[PDB]
Design a binder for this molecule. Sequence first.
Ligand code: PA5
Ligand code: PA5
Ligand code: A1IIA
Ligand code: A1IIA
Ligand code: A1IH8
Ligand code: A1IH8
Ligand code: CL
Ligand code: CL
Lengths: 550, 550
Amino acid sequence: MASFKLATDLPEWKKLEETYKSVGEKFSVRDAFAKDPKRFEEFSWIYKNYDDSKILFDFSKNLVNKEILDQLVTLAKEAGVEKLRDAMFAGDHINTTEDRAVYHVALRNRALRKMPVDGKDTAQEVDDVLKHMKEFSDSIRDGSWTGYTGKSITDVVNIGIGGSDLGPVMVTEALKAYSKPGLNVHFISNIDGTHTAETLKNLNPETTLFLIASKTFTTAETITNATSAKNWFLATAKDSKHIAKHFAALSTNEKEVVAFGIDAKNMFGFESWVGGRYSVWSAIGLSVAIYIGFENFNDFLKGAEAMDQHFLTTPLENNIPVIGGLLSVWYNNFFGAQTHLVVPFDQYLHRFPAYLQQLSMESNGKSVTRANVFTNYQTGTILFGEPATNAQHSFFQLVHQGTKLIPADFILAAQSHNPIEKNLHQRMLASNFFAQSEALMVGKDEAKVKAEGATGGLVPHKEFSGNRPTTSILAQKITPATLGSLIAYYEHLTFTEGAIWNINSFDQWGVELGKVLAKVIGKELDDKKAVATHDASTNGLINQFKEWEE
Amino acid sequence: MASFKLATDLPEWKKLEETYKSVGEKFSVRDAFAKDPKRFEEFSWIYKNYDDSKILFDFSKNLVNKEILDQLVTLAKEAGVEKLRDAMFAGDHINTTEDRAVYHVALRNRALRKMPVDGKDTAQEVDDVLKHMKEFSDSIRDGSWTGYTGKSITDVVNIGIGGSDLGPVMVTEALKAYSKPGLNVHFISNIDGTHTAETLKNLNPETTLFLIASKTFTTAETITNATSAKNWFLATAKDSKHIAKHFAALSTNEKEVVAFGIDAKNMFGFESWVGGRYSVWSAIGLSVAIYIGFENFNDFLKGAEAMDQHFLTTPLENNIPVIGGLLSVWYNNFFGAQTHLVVPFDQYLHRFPAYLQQLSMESNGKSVTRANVFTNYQTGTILFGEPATNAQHSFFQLVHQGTKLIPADFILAAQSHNPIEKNLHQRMLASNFFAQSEALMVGKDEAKVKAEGATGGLVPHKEFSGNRPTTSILAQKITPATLGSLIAYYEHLTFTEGAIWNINSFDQWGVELGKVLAKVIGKELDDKKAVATHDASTNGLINQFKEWEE
Ligand SMILES: O=C(O)[C@@H](O)[C@H](O)[C@H](O)COP(=O)(O)O
Ligand SMILES: O=C(O)[C@@H](O)[C@H](O)[C@H](O)COP(=O)(O)O
Ligand SMILES: CNCC[C@H](O)c1cccs1
Ligand SMILES: CNCC[C@H](O)c1cccs1
Ligand SMILES: OC[C@H]1CC[C@H](CO)CC1
Ligand SMILES: OC[C@H]1CC[C@H](CO)CC1
Ligand SMILES: [Cl-]
Ligand SMILES: [Cl-]
């Protein structure tokens, strides 16, 4: 139970509103650098990972100074961010609406610290699943697990949706440099039959392995997809005994897995206290272990663990995910910026924004606090993004010259996995990273536009305001460990935001509703009659569909 | 030159502010349907395509009624939307800042209407490029254009970025059902050397054709990529005489193409008046014509042409792209919603939101009007999305239960290209389409939550406000023609928004800045000394990079 009801009840909230009007609204980043020669040092932090690799988190181009950050830290203290964090790590049931622990941090407890739920350590139970994952993924990779005709597996198809899909997708794409030729992964997720048809069309049943990924093992889309995949498999295999070499399950529900025809020995389990959008660290990450090997997957976990330790043990004023979360609150609640842009200067990370979009928005898109009252202040932001340099050629127009503040995170690795042409591409990429954040800060004034040759009415069109904020995140290399730390950064940022707003970051009563009105209409689409059971728009759309369907 | 300075000073703007306060803010969509039994008919329009196929645009779950829509139409008349549209179609130089025509509509002039720029008809000149495109794409597909060892082309690699990349990507993905076995397309765009390395590593130089897609033929990323691709090609082919069978260009700049080593005969041309984000209809679409055949590409153009005719000839109150644009203004400028969500219930259309994100934000992210003064009101929204059903399990939590208004467009085809399992998947997909928009409108009140079994503090967490607006777009089938119409709808919606805001939707001075910013720093990355020529953050980031680079 909550120590306060509303974020607006915390004394520092009004003080921040007043600082916004006196200092924040008209904040000049150019002036801040001129006032404070040490600003880069003061507003950048080096994170050291467990493997002694490093990531620089530079917040110094944000609309923040010492006064503002000190106030945000006081707000975090008033909100009990540390109390809630500590309860999370203690295994307390801080998912109050589902009455569940929130223990993705236990999934990556590779040190085997005591991490109890309901007074019982989880360290060994988690480790045992990882050992099963190692054994199975090793046998897929070395050919000792063969298909029904005695061939090594060449293609692994994950079937799942939401938290049972997007993490596997994003992480296999991100760490594809660590894959091996001849072993491919695929991801079926949409119920749209296109997804199944296009994915399976050119695969060989004899050498394809399915992972059916579902926490509940009841999700409409996933079980239907999995059934259609089984039918494809059997169209060639022509005997149900062959299923056992070709289908495994990633779930919390052993009874429903067995009911589907998968042997319990090929179920990779996890617990209720793993949220889908926090699940890639669990059995749900099996596709990643198969694609890049268990040891790389373990390194990914250890990266998360090291960031967890940083979050747990660091005073707020130097705690990197907390700082990111405080700046998000600053922009969301005081500037009224509705969005948060994440731009990886990295093609492997092309699905990173999409993954973070689920993490962030599904966590923090809430209107009710832990005191069970409605928020009349803003909660979760809308997170979006695409990789650079492409984004620079497209919606960066609006980032630079539009009327909306869009706080932005830019991410670059100093070293490429693909340093082709003697690192020419990489140097060009990095130059863009530095130059874009610089430009967003410094802008281009009327005098400069004139000096560059514009006259008369053209001039204002070529001006740039500057003072457009960015956070720059520079890693040495996007290894498994680094990616693990980067995701955990955003997990704990998300945590911080939710703690300040006093929401439950860990339920999802909208995604849960997502299965009820659809079943009602599904049955109406199976009947022949025109429908009149809904509002006129829903009826009209259904009836028009009925006239146009096959 | 403009007939007004600022949208806020059009007479109807202050009237719409008063209507927002009195009727708009607290608008009840449920009450609207109860008051008007004909609401679905009054606020939905069937669009008829040139091939007699249809698309239903249902706006009736929006926060709009006759009073509001009539005021928005008056606003459009005061802003001179029709006069600017007519000037666009006349070939006038409405891109005032670059002194260019805006003539993507001429690209899809299959009717060969008189469409002049600078007083000279473009119809035959456009048509002649399309004839070249047909000839070449036919020759790729029929194996008469062979590689340097006499083999059919199997892989076509477009190299380009932004406007020269995202349309080809999105449309080849969208129309993949119309492709043929054994002829694949790929898209290199990022400067990041990963993009080139991963795309080329398993292709055969003997059967790979490159299209270098660049309006200017000077873009740094594209020319660098193209050079690296030529190096890869020559590593196997050895003799540069073989380049003529493997490299073609899509460009306005013949001199630079020929300087690169591409024969002028293998340039597919277009003109200055094609903006990149409006360019897939031009030579830039050659990869589409190769992948799906010229006839399908031509059908795509004819769908756009039909929607152009609708936009040109329809009174504002019944003009479908104008209505969409008026609603956008309503939400952006009166409700203060910063975002616009686009969700295709269609996996083929997975890259459709990203394409629209460029179209929309790059067009309308501006702060200066055609009277060359700064705005005192919001312009372009932030457009985002992913396909459903994935999105329902990603971020729809926030759409349903968060604190932000997010106008959403949902798109479904009645018929799938892949009606597997006797259309089971398709019926399930459709059910979701109808149910999600219904749910966003109806919500779920406190009493219903109690009736469903929640007590005490759990109750508010399970409430849904409803009155969350959607637009539903139901097509018969996403054919080439349908997709052409759909993109043109969003082009003309974008046009409408910009016309009301009095901005130039057709320049992109932030994208142009980005293309000259990186070279300065690139030269500093080539020296190995530490740098102190910038602000302390930019210096700090460059210097840390230098410490960490290979
Ligand atoms: O975030 C969520 O809870 C949803 O995306 C789930 O992750 C998705 O609905 C799949 O649920 P399950 O894993 O139970 O099949
Ligand atoms: O929208 C734009 O203008 C950009 O995205 C361009 O398409 C991109 O910069 C590539 O330009 P070009 O086609 O001249 O290579
Ligand atoms: C072989 N599978 C064992 C699964 C294990 O019992 C579980 C772990 C977590 C939930 S269920
Ligand atoms: C064979 N290529 C000719 C290209 C033609 O001249 C052009 C058309 C549009 C711009 S340039
Ligand atoms: O073309 C591949 C497709 C896969 C799913 C089956 C399901 O019956 C149909 C064939
Ligand atoms: O591995 C494929 C890669 C492609 C680009 C060339 C550029 O030199 C290097 C090899
Ligand atoms: Cl297990
Ligand atoms: Cl041509």
